[PDB]
């Protein structure tokens, strides 16, 4: 999962541009990278982060999870 | 350093103010971002500038990316606080598939 | 290092201090962080200053750990004592996104 574009994931398109600010590329980019860190970003405020969340919830993979030899 | 259009208004790119000479008590207050948008079409008097070079020379040195609708609503309130015309070409304008073009005069104070 | 500021301000930042050219005899007391803002608003006069900036330049040279909120508070009251209207700025100004603006001119004595 964690090797697909973060178009695959039904974002508003507010959140797509404050993720295109910060060149996330690809999922897994942006789950190494925790809420503080995130919200410290133009336009990307509460409401953005909570849906985010929620819908990485759905994915099941909240933001801070780190992995091995990436990649 | 400071700008006048059309022998009206006078601007400047680093304090982003507007005076309009018929009313010179009243300053005029604008957003960074129409106001850097019509710096840079002073920048180039009275040519075409193309819609996707001037949004990405405006907004890429900003950090973020937006998407276009940006554009067209910063022009809409550029050309609504200006009181320029609604369609007519007398300050500002849209020239279609080619991008946005600007008829007033360029007189650069200083 | 003192400055002068929109001709009608003398600030001393090694005294932290503020004097009117209307008023000579009354110095205002301005708080470090204060006077540490407009040090560097002087040091960069009227190129736009970024907020990370500010709070690092500020609170990392005395180790202090606050929150980014603290530079609105501490702009606030700078606002405020230097009677500066915050609809119509013609000291400080906020860019948003991007930071904070000197927009007054800043003068070097000595």
Known sequence: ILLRPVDDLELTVRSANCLKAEAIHYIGDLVQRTEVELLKTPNLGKKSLTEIKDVLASRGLSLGMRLENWP | ?110
Do not use: C
Not at chain 2, 67 to 94: G, N
């Open chain 2, 1 to 110: 350093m400071k700008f006048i259009l059309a022998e009206k208004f006078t601007f400047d790119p680093l304090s982003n103010t507007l005076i309009d000479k018929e009313d010179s008590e009243e300053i005029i207050r604008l957003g960074s971002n129409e106001s850097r948008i019509l710096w840079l079409l002073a920048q180039r008097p009275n040519e075409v500038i193309s819609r996707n070079d001037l949004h990405d020379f405006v907004w890429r040195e900003q950090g973020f990316e937006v998407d276009d609708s940006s554009l067209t609503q910063a022009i809409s309130t550029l050309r609504k606080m200006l009181k320029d015309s609604t369609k007519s070409p007398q300050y500002v304008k849209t020239v279609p598939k080619r991008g946005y073009q600007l008829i007033a005069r360029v007189e650069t104070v200083e």
